[PDB]
């Protein structure tokens, strides 16, 4: 939640799961909260492909 809220525009943690299950990503198991700090450019690729 604290990783996603760094965008500034009002994108919450609930909307990341809106467009995390609509775009069919089965069960990343909140280990994107691990590579959200071990690989912040890769979680920027995660979220920037959730947008598209």
């Amino acid at each position: 939640n604290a990783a996603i809220r760094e965008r500034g525009v009002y994108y919450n943690y609930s909307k990341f799961i809106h467009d995390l299950y609509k775009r069919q990503l089965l069960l990343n198991r909140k280990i994107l909260a691990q590579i959200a700090i071990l690989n912040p450019n890769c979680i920027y690729m995660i979220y920037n492909e959730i947008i598209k």
């Binding site: 939640n1 604290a2 990783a3 809220r5 760094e6 959200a36 700090i37 912040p40």
Partner: protein, 66 residues
């Protein structure tokens, strides 16, 4: 200046913890220093200015400070 008190206090709190950082661990001090200038001109809404009491008390009875 002209900011309401409690929502400013919550958004100062959410940075004073470190819950805007992906390095947030609630057992260490990952937060950030904040500075609040112009504390004399903090807005409040309704009738806080004449009805909200910051009372305190020492240990002995009859010391509750209005």
């Amino acid at each position: 200046t002209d900011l309401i008190l409690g929502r400013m206090a919550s958004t100062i709190a959410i940075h004073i913890r470190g819950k805007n950082l992906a390095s947030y661990t609630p057992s260490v001090d990952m937060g950030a220093f904040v500075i609040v200038v112009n504390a004399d001109k903090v807005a409040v809404s309704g009738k806080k200015r004449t009805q909200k009491l910051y009372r305190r008390h020492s240990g002995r009875p009859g010391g509750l400070k209005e």
